[PDB]
Amino acid sequence: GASSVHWFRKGLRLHDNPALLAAVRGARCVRCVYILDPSVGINRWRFLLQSLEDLDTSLRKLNSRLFVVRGQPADVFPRLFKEWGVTRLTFEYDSEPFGKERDAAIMKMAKEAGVEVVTENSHTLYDLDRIIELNGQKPPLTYKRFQALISRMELPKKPAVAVSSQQMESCRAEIQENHDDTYGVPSLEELGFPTEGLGPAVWQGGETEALARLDKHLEMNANSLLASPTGLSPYLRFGCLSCRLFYYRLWDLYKKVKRNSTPPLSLFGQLLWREFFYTAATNNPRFDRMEGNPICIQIPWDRNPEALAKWAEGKTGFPWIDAIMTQLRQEGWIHHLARHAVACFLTRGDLWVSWESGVRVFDELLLDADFSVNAGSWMWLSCSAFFQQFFHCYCPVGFGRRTDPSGDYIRRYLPKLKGFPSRYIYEPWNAPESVQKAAKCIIGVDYPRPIVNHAETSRLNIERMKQIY
Ligand SMILES: COc1ccc(-n2nc3c(c2NC(=O)C2(c4ccc(Cl)cc4)CCCC2)CS(=O)(=O)C3)cc1
């Protein structure tokens, strides 16, 4: 039979893995491979490492192991083809422009080597290219048009069966005694990160964590802004959780809870915004840039290195903004409303810095942000693309006050401000000296003064946006 390699990139799971099913079918031998390539934050890397460890543990239960190989796929796969005598290579499709070109090169090489290639598109709900075909060979640039297209398309494919124990026993690969020395999942130190006092990850990686969270998930305040134990978005981004499994379990719950067996599209709204951005990005190599991006409004943003760095580090002097950016840096996830506040502050609201710089910082820190979804949300938020009708105004003080009147969210991530009363914690520069000394926090010494006058900068910025449009 076949000597198969399943290539993990996304789709870091055994459930709903049709590409892995294709590798297993009629195989004498199967080897699951992740290729580690020797800017990116520690939370992203730790999440990846934990997901790979989970896969290795899962494969141990099926009399197998994960093969983590270091190098570039273009160099690695020829050596592996010859060394393992591979006859079949399978992986989950990657719609993103860079991944498409990489994968096309691997497939052409595997054809020239005589190796069979199978790909499955189980990272998304739909065939993105089919959506583009039905829209006249262009991606839809509004969510309303995107929703009209998929409403007439056939439902997403149901989640595939996870591979059997008997299937994996039929093609167990020989594991050498030094497998961990050659193919082991590296540690954070081995990736170049010294671990100085790091506590348990707020977002533990892996398919097992993903499936446990899904079960609890199907069972606005300060608590709403905290990381939730039923949160699923990092697991969808890495593929620890199948989006089609989520889609249909969500549907099953709707039918059990409500009478109708016809749920509104908004119940899938998060999956559909995901899907919409993937559709728009797949044929646009410049999706995450302004210049040369055919869907992006050209806007003369300011270059402001100091303000950009202060925003990125949570040193703006607006506690709402700084607390969000602190949560993002420390944990790797922030609420969508917090993303609004922080993106609008950087771009059209206050700093007039390009959404491209926001994409870069979020790419480094945000666990659920990939090329398509990150850049898409930033162009959408900053009114650079997707036919944005009105400019949503978020005050870096009032929106925080409205979302968490208690101020405890600030107190959690900015402990230096813990002593400020709720009436001042979003604008501590307005606290009298006596209040600042009682809180043991002198504005301008212990915590910075606000770096902009929001009233004045927001007025100038909203007029520039009107003139541009
Ligand atoms: C600006 O930086 C970012 C803000 C959000 C994300 N992001 N990440 C995920 C998802 C989103 N985006 C959204 O859902 C929307 C959105 C856009 C902009 C903002 Cl500010 C807030 C929400 C798109 C339009 C309305 C909802 C959905 S997901 O599973 O597909 C995971 C990424 C980067």
UniProtKB/Swiss-Prot annotation:
Span list, region Required for inhibition of CLOCK-BMAL1-mediated transcription: 352-451
GO terms for MF: damaged DNA binding; FAD binding; kinase binding; nuclear receptor binding; phosphatase binding; photoreceptor activity; protein kinase binding; protein phosphatase inhibitor activity
Cofactor: FAD; (6R)-5,10-methylene-5,6,7,8-tetrahydrofolate
Crosslink (Glycyl lysine isopeptide (Lys-Gly) (interchain with G-Cter in ubiquitin)) position: K10, K100, K216, K310, K437, K466
Record entry for activity regulation: KL001 (N-[3-(9H-carbazol-9-yl)-2-hydroxypropyl]-N-(2-furanylmethyl)-methanesulfonamide) binds to CRY1 and stabilizes it by inhibiting FBXL3- and ubiquitin-dependent degradation of CRY1 resulting in lengthening of the circadian periods. KL001-mediated CRY1 stabilization can inhibit glucagon-induced gluconeogenesis in primary hepatocytes.
Domain of life (superkingdom): Eukaryota
Annotated phenotype, changing G317D: Loss of ability to inhibit CLOCK-BMAL1-mediated transcriptional activity. No loss of ability to inhibit NR1I2 transcriptional activity
Effect of R464Q: Inhibits interaction with PER2. Does not suppress its nuclear localization. Inhibits its repression activity on CLOCK|NPAS2-BMAL1-driven transcription
Annotated effect of mutating R339A: Impairs protein folding. Abolishes binding of BMAL1, PER1 and FBXL3. Strongly reduces SKP1 binding
Cellular localisation: Cytoplasm; Nucleus
Keyword Thylakoid: no
Outcome recorded upon mutating S228D: Reduced inhibition of CLOCK-BMAL1-mediated transcriptional activity. No effect on nuclear localization nor on protein stability
Cofactor, free-text remark: Binds 1 FAD per subunit. Only a minority of the protein molecules contain bound FAD. Contrary to the situation in photolyases, the FAD is bound in a shallow, surface-exposed pocket. Binds 1 5,10-methenyltetrahydrofolate (MTHF) non-covalently per subunit.
Knockout or disruption consequences: Animals show longer circadian periods. Double knockouts of CRY1 and CRY2 show slightly decrease body weight and lose the cycling rhythmicity of feeding behavior, energy expenditure and glucocorticorids expression. Glucose homeostasis is severely disrupted and animals exhibit elevated blood glucose in response to acute feeding after an overnight fast as well as severely impaired glucose clearance in a glucose tolerance test. When challenged with high-fat diet, animals rapidly gain weight and surpass that of wild-type mice, despite displaying hypophagia.
UniProt key word Mitochondrion: no
Cellular component aspect of the GO annotation: Cry-Per complex; cytosol; extracellular region; mitochondrion; nuclear speck; nucleoplasm; nucleus
In-chain residues carrying the UniProt-annotated modification Phosphoserine: S64, S228, S261
Outcome of swapping R360K: Reduced interaction with NR1I2 and NR1I3. Significant decrease in interaction with NR1I2 and NR1I3
Oligomer and partners: Component of the circadian core oscillator, which includes the CRY proteins, CLOCK or NPAS2, BMAL1 or BMAL2, CSNK1D and/or CSNK1E, TIMELESS, and the PER proteins. Interacts with TIMELESS. Interacts directly with PER1, PER2 and PER3; interaction with PER2 inhibits its ubiquitination and vice versa. Interacts with CLOCK-BMAL1. Interacts with BMAL1. Interacts with CLOCK. Interacts with NFIL3. Interacts with FBXL3 and FBXL21. FBXL3, PER2 and the cofactor FAD compete for overlapping binding sites. FBXL3 cannot bind CRY2 that interacts already with PER2 or that contains bound FAD.
Family designation: Belongs to the DNA photolyase class-1 family.
Official protein name in the record: Cryptochrome-2
Organism: Mus musculus
Gene: Cry2
